[PDB]
Design a protein around this ligand. Sequence first.
Ligand code: HEM
Length: 395
Amino acid sequence: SHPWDVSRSDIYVEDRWQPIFAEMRAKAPVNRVPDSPYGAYWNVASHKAIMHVESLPELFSSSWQYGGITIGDPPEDVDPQKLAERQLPMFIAMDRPDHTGQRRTVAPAFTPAKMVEMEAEIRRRTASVLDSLPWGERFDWVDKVSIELTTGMLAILFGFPWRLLTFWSDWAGLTLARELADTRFGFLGEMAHYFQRLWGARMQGDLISMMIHSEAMNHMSPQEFMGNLVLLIVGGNDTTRNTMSGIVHALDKFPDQRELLERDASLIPNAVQECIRYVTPLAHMRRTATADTELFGNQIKAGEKVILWYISANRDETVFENPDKLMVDRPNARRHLSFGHGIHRCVGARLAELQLRILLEEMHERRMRVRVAGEVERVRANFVHGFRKLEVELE
Ligand code: HEM
């Protein structure tokens, strides 16, 4: 099924996946892809099947041992433990019970209590950044806004020395280029050392603080430490950037909506949820079947890749009436799957929602309107989904 091989990056760059996942959703929501630059695998394409799969982790594992949570798998041939150091264990890629203790030790930084406590500094930062922007001129929003605010946000959380650490997120987050694996492991080396120094420094409220004071994560293997660092870095970086990029693009595509949001900005909390759905910053997550099973009248064999395509689920007509339309006021926006579902569901969702609400808010104080002007580059990927560059002009 070359025709339902949706691991190809063109269709996300060319933004033409819509008809393909619709065919799947109609004829076979679950279906097996026999070969691809990623071997064989199952599409899981409907809303209910993703929620289903994701609610049985003992049976659809997300463990790094089986291969982690992406559509890629480590090797080729590759060199042994002398260079089989590459693969990174991380709690997103851990089964229970290990996952539970690891999540529980970052979770308190994302209590609602702590979002009330973090609102104020975010608002100022957003206000500032947003106030430095040149009305009339054309500039790169990704760079000037979305990277700035998100990697800003990420710095706060770690207690990082104040675009700086976004370097080794675009690095960690290409798996198809043999030649480039060495220079990648290099870069992740750098940050590992850097974050190691930072570890000893704190070791004397940030995620280091909370990780240092946790028996889960105080004694992490070199590999795991790199992997968990990759998680919290990428987790709280790329997804929010791209949502931020997609928002202005989506609204520039759907101005009907923008001028309804302009009229009524009580609709922002929901606007955030409709953009997160529309954009789907991460287009999929992976699981690996743990044993033989019926999934949706399909016989999943033990060990097979199961790809959960949120990007399809977020346009499942069973739940989203007129799905390809951005409907800011859409009353069930909330029930999208851009944060996943179940035990691994985004531990950060609330923080993202803040950043994005606050932005939409002090934007609409300045009565900003963002027009997409110059070049517009989507990320070349089947995993990350959003923009490298998005040039824009203002009201
Ligand atoms: C629009 C913003 C975001 C999106 C779309 C997003 C999406 C996701 C997705 C799809 C997962 C995997 C869920 C699953 O497999 O069931 C996830 C997990 C995670 N996200 Fe996010 N995320 C966002 C923001 C953040 C932020 C701001 C942070 C941290 C600062 C963060 C940290 C994490 C972590 C740590 C995990 C692993 C959680 C676990 O396995 O228990 N994310 N996120």
